[PDB]
Amino acid sequence: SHMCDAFVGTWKLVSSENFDDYMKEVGVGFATRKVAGMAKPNMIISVNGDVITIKSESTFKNTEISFILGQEFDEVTADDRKVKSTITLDGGVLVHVQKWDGKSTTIKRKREDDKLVVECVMKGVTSTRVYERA
C-alpha cells in the first residue's frame, strides 16, 4: 500500500458549486461553459508503480493524464488549453498546478469521508466539486 491508495477508484460527480464563476475566471467561453457545466463526469484514478493516471469521462469530453509526482508534463485540458502541469502530494492532498499564457490555476483533490472533494482555484474564485464512488 502506498501513496495514493485512498484515491484509487471510479468517482462520479454529485455536486458542484461556483464552477461557472471558476470557468469565467479561467477565460472559458460561453458555449463551453454551458455544455461543460451540464456534465456529470467520472474521475477514474489508478496507480501503476510511480505513475498515476487520472481519466475524466464525460458527455462533454474525455481526457486523461498520466504523471509522476513532482515532474512537469504537458496537458491539454477539456476546454482545449495547452498547459504545463505539475502534481504533488502535500499532506495527503493531490495538488495540481496548471500554467499557461502567464496564468496559473490550482486544483486540489482530497479524500473526505467517502467522498473525493475537488477544490478549483483561479485568482480569488474557488469552485468545490464533490464526487462519490461509482
131 known member of a binding site: yes
Q: Which residues contact 4 (CB under 8 A, 6 or more apart)?
A: 45, 47, 52, 89, 94
77 contacts ligand QJX (rule: CB under 6 A): yes
The partner residues of 85 in beta bridges, in order of sequence, read 73, 98
Among 65, 78, 83, 121, binds ligand QJX (CB under 6 A): 78
In the complex with ligand QJX, the residue whose CB is nearer, 1 or 80, is 80
118 labelled as ligand-binding? no
Q: How many helices (H) and strands (E) does the chain have?
A: 2, 10
- φ/ψ of 40, rounded to 5, equals -120, 80
Residue 25 per-residue DSSP state: H
For residue 29, the SS3 value is: coil
Choice between 87 and 118, CB closer to ligand QJX: 118
* Residues 6+ away with beta carbon under 8 Å from 6: 111
- Subset of residues 1 to 60 that bind ligand QJX, contact rule: CB under 6 A: 13, 23, 26, 28, 36, 39, 41, 43, 56, 58, 60
Q: Which is nearer to ligand QJX, 49 or 74 (CB)?
A: 74
Binding region: 129-131
What are the residues binding ligand QJX (CB under 6 A)? 13, 23, 26, 28, 36, 39, 41, 43, 56, 58, 60-61, 77-79, 107, 118, 120, 129
Binding residues for a fatty acid: 129-131
